[model samples]
Target: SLTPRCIIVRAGQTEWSKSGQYTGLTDLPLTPYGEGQMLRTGESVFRNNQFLNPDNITYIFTSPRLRARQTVDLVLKPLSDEQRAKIRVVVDDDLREWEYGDYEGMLTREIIELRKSRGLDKERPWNIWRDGCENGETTQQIGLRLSRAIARIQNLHRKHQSEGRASDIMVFAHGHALRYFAAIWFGLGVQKKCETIEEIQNVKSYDDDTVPYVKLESYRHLVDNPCFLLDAGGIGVLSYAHHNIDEPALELAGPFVSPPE
Candidate 1:
């Protein structure tokens, strides 16, 4: 009867993150306030059957970056020695921040301005999803990798369901990468062809076994644009509907627990 869950966590603030710079592939540390943010968040959630019950989790896959790893470490610091042993912290590259390529440490406005000077993106401005970073990763590329990584987690949950093990997972990563990961949670991929709102409605229904993967070149209401969002030092959840793994759902908020002493 145990339901498996996937927890998505964004790294705490980095200097670049605070400065409004895009920090893809750039390694940075969390600000002091960011550290305190996670420490308290940890104190509140690391309780029995609470926001992040370590009893149910076996592994925490964090991005192979100092910022993401530091966030993980701090959040886990409040655990008792026994509770800590229950988890194995892992650095997984699949959770790596999207490579920003040429725009690694630039802001969105700066990128557009720079591109304009080069006589680029005349018709439209630079968009990470639509235009992609110059010499950086693309939407299509991010989708495929996240898809593969998700499969690994899903596969584990499959076996745990039968054994009645609460094999919840925790992922510590960057903002953009986590957002993309959540969008693909429902078999949603980088759509190349924009579909009408009515057409999107036709994609799935209650009777459908699984949400059909659709490709739309742009974002639509709740499809890709606002599906999920996490700030630095923020947390989110992913679980299934009706205890069925086929119906992956994002939890808007986790359960409430007593305030930490």
Candidate 2:
């Protein structure tokens, strides 16, 4: 049985990210320290890991944003020329950050203030998941795009499985978009109830004992950088249980064992 895993490598920190701004559609390059952090991540995680072997990766999909493209380049640098050439890298629009529109480049506090001045949501705080940014994408829109991307990746995985090969795929994109991807990956809709991390973690699965709500890869913390690598820019894994695409689950707990045929 062949089990394919989708590896999500979040783009490194940008100026806007450092300032806690909503960075949608605004192209910002990774800061110097950000680049160094990604280089270290490549050396540690992607170099000789059992699960994320460069040779095992069959395809790569990246957002067109410069930050994400740069992160992918640095993360995959350790691979030999031949190994890199063997993988297909596609720049996908579907992987772009959530479009913030009027809220683009604004910090969370600033957005709240603006909304308050406009007399919108006076009783409760503004939630992007519930009330999308003015003139921006709704939760349904983001879910639809991610659903298409998931279907395409699953089809590719199926093809490689039939050929007796590992179908490990990589996706490089922004924070909000990647989070949405994770939610939609597990058949969860991106709505108000599923907005916060706490809310998402509380979601129940078919097998409580076998499946956890979400499982994430861990990364070493950098001294100078206060933010955790995964929070700023790091990699995580998404896969199915028992080689069954219908049973989408996060890659955590331990090694996946295929059931007897």
- In lDDT terms, which candidate is top? 1
Clash pairs (backbone) in predicted model 1: 191-215, 191-216
How do the predictions measure up, each by TM-score?
Answer: 0.81, 0.79
By TM-score, the best candidate is 1
State, as a TM-score between 0 and 1, how close model 2 is to the true structure: 0.79
Q: Each candidate: what lDDT?
A: 0.72, 0.71
Candidate 1 Cα lDDT to native: 0.72
Cα lDDT tens digits, model 2, 1-261, are 458889888899888888888888988999998899787778766544433677788888888899999999887778889889888888778688889989999988898999999999878777776566789986655655565567667767767778888878898998877776766666554223234453233222122231112322211111121122346676778888888777878765322334335
Per-residue lDDT tens digits for candidate 1, residues 73-162, read 898887789987877776667678778898889888888888898899878656676556678876655655566457667766776797
Off by over 4 Å in 2: 48-51, 190-230, 253-261
